[PDB]
Symmetry: D2
Subunit: 30 residues, 4 copies
C-alpha cells in the first residue's frame, strides 16, 4: 500500500515534468 | 539552446523518477 | 511570467520529492 | 539499505531541479 501510493505520486510528478518540458520547447520554438 | 537542453534534462529526470517508481513497486510486490 | 512560474513549479516539485524521500527513510527505519 | 539509497537519489534529483529553477530565473531576469 504505502510504497504503491508513493510510486504513483512519482509517476504523477514525472507527468508534470513532461508537461513543463513541452512548455519550454514551445517557448523555444514558437 | 538552453531551453531545449533544460527540457531534455526534465524529460530525463522524469524517466529516472519512473524507474524509481518501478523499483518501489517491485520492492512492494516481490 | 512564464519562466518564473515554471521555476516555482520546479522548486515545489523538488520540495515534494524531498518529502517523499523522508517518507521512504521513515518506512525503512521505523 | 535499498529504500535509503532510493531516498538519496530523490534528494539528488531535487537538487538538480533546484539548479534548473535557478537557471530559468537567471534567463528570465538577466
Ligand atoms: Na533557449
Ligand atoms: Na518568461
Amino acid at each position: 500500500g504505502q510504497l504503491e501510493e508513493i510510486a504513483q505520486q512519482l509517476e504523477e510528478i514525472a507527468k508534470q515534468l513532461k508537461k513543463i518540458a513541452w512548455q519550454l520547447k514551445k517557448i523555444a520554438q514558437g
